[PDB]
């Protein structure tokens with residue numbers, strides 16, 4: 800599909816057996832989701848943006864389905880105010896910017 | 899152009915007569931540029947990102963060229979970690995997400 804940017808590009812995702820709404824975010828290197836209880840190993844990470852940094856948990860090789868498109872890769876989890884799909888997974892579903 | 903997302907979608911912009919590099923950021927409602935001198939009247943504003951809130955100078959109706967495409971809109975100036983082009987200007991240049 801084609802998503803215009805009049806409004807926030809929020810799409811439905813499926814991860815860890817849950818459906819959520821998340822932002823298709825070309826400005827995010829890596830996906831970061833709001834706090835959730837994922838199983839498995841993780842590593843601490845710090846990610847920075849406007850206002851400074853937050854601490855997150857980095858999970859590797861996590862399956863996410865994004866508007867019916869499957870993807871598997873790094874998913875960070877932490878106190879983000881919004882679920883963010885980053886470039887690391889957007890490349891896997893075929894997402895480009897066009898103008 | 900069609901821009902893939904295996905690298906950061908950085909583009910050359912022109913604002914106030916000066917060339918800069920900026921990030922096309924579909925997760926940003928607004929355009930936020932690093933500290934710079936800009937002609938025009940401005941108002942003090944606050945904007946929030948992943949790490950908290952920052953003070954910015956809001957310049958209205960600013961001419962800005964993005965990768966050869968002209969826009970006229972709001973530009974926020976402050977201590978952002980990177981020059982980001984938000985949806986307020988990406989809509990003006992006809993930018994969409996496609997997969």
Ligand SMILES: CC(C)CN(C[C@@H](O)[C@H](Cc1ccccc1)NC(=O)O[C@H]1CO[C@H]2OCC[C@H]21)S(=O)(=O)c1ccc(N)cc1
Nearest residue numbers: 824826827828829846847848849925926927928946947948
């Ligand atoms: C500033 C960018 C280079 C990086 N950010 C992605 C960006 O899209 C965030 C994503 C975002 C979106 C909402 C809330 C927090 C973060 N947007 C943002 O800060 O936009 C602000 C300017 O316009 C306003 O609209 C939204 C917030 C304001 S980030 O959220 O900090 C980020 C950084 C690293 C990763 N791996 C993932 C996300």
